[PDB]
Design a protein around this nucleic acid. Structure first.
Ligand SMILES: [Mg+2]
Ligand SMILES: [Mg+2]
Ligand SMILES: [Zn+2]
Ligand SMILES: [Zn+2]
Ligand SMILES: [Zn+2]
Ligand SMILES: [Zn+2]
Lengths: 162, 162
DNA sequence: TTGACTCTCTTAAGAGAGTCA
DNA sequence: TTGACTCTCTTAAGAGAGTCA
């Protein structure tokens, strides 16, 4: 809600509830031929999810609290960042999964950044493969690699140069 | 329907027309602190665009030819790839700008790949900065870099470990 | 046959809000 | 007040199809 105290209280309640989610170990590529271990705090697959949580989409959830008799609701991964600016360079800030695991609500696996920065982590080589993200990646992005291009640049005639 | 010879004739007429688009020289980052040059063949900003071309969206165009009284229409960047497979790994193939310049229709600046591969080139370090795309990038992706993350992973209590 | 407009849709990373019990 | 559902929207890389003269 409006007060910093009320916001800190929302963050504290969220952390307490998510801290009781099942902790699932995931071994992950780091880049550079190395592997690491992440501990994700995963929201349940079906109701009940936890106090204050409800599912609004196949992999979308919301957290809600009643403050001053009014319901306040947020995207379930945005709560850690309620005291941060909600935009940057005129772009909306988004909750970004460093573990690339949507059900995870571990705030040690989340950052707050533009949707472009968020998306781009999918292709990052990872913290041991050359990640240059100032807020460093926790793993190599799941889509990093050579790709599967069907056809490359080509011309039939002689009208074009690179 | 259309024979492979009719398709080649469409590609040839498309190349003839695109080859007469204004050619703009762009200096671009290659990665590794190096600079290179790309020559983009840019569709005009407003009508007329060129024989067979029409705008269906702010940065979307289509190419149209009528053959034996039947109207055929294609996305304006898909024409170079009409003799190629149109899917791979269960994913639709898309025209992917190696020059990251949507108005460009230079077929030497295009490849044909999944939408995920396509998007990922936005963050590639480039052909002189560590690109691992099998069909190599022509330049560093426009969104490559440290990013502008507003807040990193953090917790208020001690409920979480990474 | 052609040009110049019109409309809505896909994907996968993210969102806000209403209806009931 | 709290839970469990419902719906559509945003973005930026990409698409298909209709109308009129
Ligand atoms: Mg993400
Ligand atoms: Mg692209
Ligand atoms: Zn996680
Ligand atoms: Zn990274
Ligand atoms: Zn180009
Ligand atoms: Zn590349």
């Amino acid at each position: 809600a409006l007060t910093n105290a009320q916001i800190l209280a929302v963050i504290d309640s969220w952390e307490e509830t998510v801290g009781q989610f099942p902790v699932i170990t995931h071994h992950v590529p780091l880049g550079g031929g190395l592997q690491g271990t992440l501990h994700c705090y995963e929201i349940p697959l079906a109701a009940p999810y936890g106090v204050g949580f409800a599912k609004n989409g196949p992999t979308r959830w919301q957290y809600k609290r009643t403050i001053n008799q009014v319901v306040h609701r947020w995207g379930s991964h945005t709560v850690p960042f309620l005291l941060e600016p909600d935009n940057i360079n005129g772009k909306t800030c988004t909750a970004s999964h460093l573990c690339h695991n949507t059900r995870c609500h571990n705030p040690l696996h989340l950052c707050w950044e533009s949707l472009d920065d968020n998306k781009g982590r999918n292709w990052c080589p990872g913290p041991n493969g050359g990640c240059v993200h100032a807020v460093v990646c926790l793993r190599q992005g799941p889509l990093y690699g050579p790709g599967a291009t069907v056809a490359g640049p080509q011309q039939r005639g002689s009208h074009f140069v690179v």
